[PDB]
Each structure stands twice: as C-alpha cells, then as structure tokens.
Amino acid sequence: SVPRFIKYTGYGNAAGLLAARGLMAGGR
Amino acid sequence: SKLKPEVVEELTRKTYFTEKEVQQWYKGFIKDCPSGQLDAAGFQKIYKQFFPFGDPTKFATFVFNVFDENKDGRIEFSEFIQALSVTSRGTLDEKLRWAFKLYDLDNDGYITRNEMLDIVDAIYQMVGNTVELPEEENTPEKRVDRIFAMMDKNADGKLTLQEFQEGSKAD
Ligand SMILES: [Ca+2]
Ligand SMILES: [Ca+2]
Ligand SMILES: [Cl-]
Ligand code: NA
C-alpha cells in the first residue's frame, strides 16, 4: 500500500503536506 | 516563553489559527527551539528523524529557504506560524500557490521541467520510491514528463501559476 498522498507528488500537495508535518514536529 | 499580546493578536489575524492555538504553537516551538530561531541543521534533523534511511538534505533545504521569508538563515516564530497556517490550513488554491513558490526555484515566475524534477527527486530521495518491475520503474523523470506535459496546456516548456493550480482540479 502506497502512502496515500504520494500520488500527488509533482502536483504540489505532497510537498505541502510534508512541509506541514515537519513544522508540526518542530513545534511538538 | 511569553509572547507579547500585540504579536499574538497580529499573528492570529494573519493566520487560520485561534489566539489559543498561536500561543500553543509558540510554547511548543520555544520548547524545541529555546532561542526562538530554527536553523537549517535543526530543520533537516526533523526530516532525518522522519526518514532516517532516506536523504532529506535536498527537500529540507528547498522548503527551509521558502519558509525563511526574510532570508536571514533562520525560521522565526512569525515565519513558522504563517508557514504552518498556509501549508496545513490553506484552501487548495492557497496551498498550491505556496507550492508554486517552492517549485519555482529560480524565482523567475515559471516552473520549468528541471525544477519540477528537482522537487520530485528531492521527495523520493527523502521518502523513497514504490518498488516496481524494472520495465515499469517509478523514476521521477517519467512521472514528471507525464505531469509536466499535462499541465503545460500551451506547451511552451514552462508552467504558470494558473497552469499549475489547475493540475488536479476537475472540470
Ligand atoms: Ca528568517
Ligand atoms: Ca523558475
Ligand atoms: Cl508535490
Ligand atoms: Na505553459
């Protein structure tokens, strides 16, 4: 089973989600 | 970790967070970064912890430089929270406008195919690729060739924000 969002790699949404998750880790 | 009320209110207003959420994000941010300034090594440390056997160097650098709005080499809380607001809570158009800033690596207003490949390759370098038959290999190049061609409606070798924002949107 592929990671749900990596179908969106190259469309912008994958980078956005990974970016968001890094910031969330930086604040927890 | 006490944020001045005027700053809390301004960062509230500028984001999708409530005042309580802004203060909670600040407490956690200052807990992890006691000076209030996150540097590039600490930003990559976060991604290496996610993907300890990928190489997050490239992705972390590209995203860090976009997050560092004033290009002083540090992510300050104002940058942290406005970046988190758009990437986590933005509308689809706002999230894609943010992604356009990331992909447009030379800031000339267009995404070229080499730039789309640099981001996609950065992603696969960090998180990996789906194991496939050698004849159907999941190479960033062939994925980018497909998507780039689909979005370049006028086939001029370059993508505008408008061409990009319409990429997964249905008509
Ligand atoms: Ca900065
Ligand atoms: Ca460009
Ligand atoms: Cl993406
Ligand atoms: Na075009």
Question: Can you describe what's shown?
Answer:
The complex is a heterodimer of chains A (28) and B (171). With 28 residues, chain A is an all-alpha fold. Chain A has one helix and no strands. Chain A is elongated, with a radius of gyration of 10 Å. In chain B, the strands form two sheets. A two-stranded antiparallel ribbon of chain B has the order 1-2. A two-stranded antiparallel ribbon of chain B has the order 3-4. In chain B, helix 3 packs across helix 4, helix 4 crosses helix 7 and helix 7 crosses helix 8. The longest helix of chain B has 15 residues. The complex binds calcium ion (2 copies), chloride ion and sodium ion. Chloride ion (CL) binds next to helix 1 of chain A. Chain B: One of its GO terms (molecular function) is calcium ion binding. Chain B: Keywords: Calcium, Cell membrane, Cytoplasm, Golgi apparatus, Lipoprotein, Membrane, Metal-binding, Myristate, Pharmaceutical, Repeat, Synapse. Chain B: It holds the Pfam family EF-hand_7. Chain B: It is a peripheral membrane protein; Lipid-anchor.
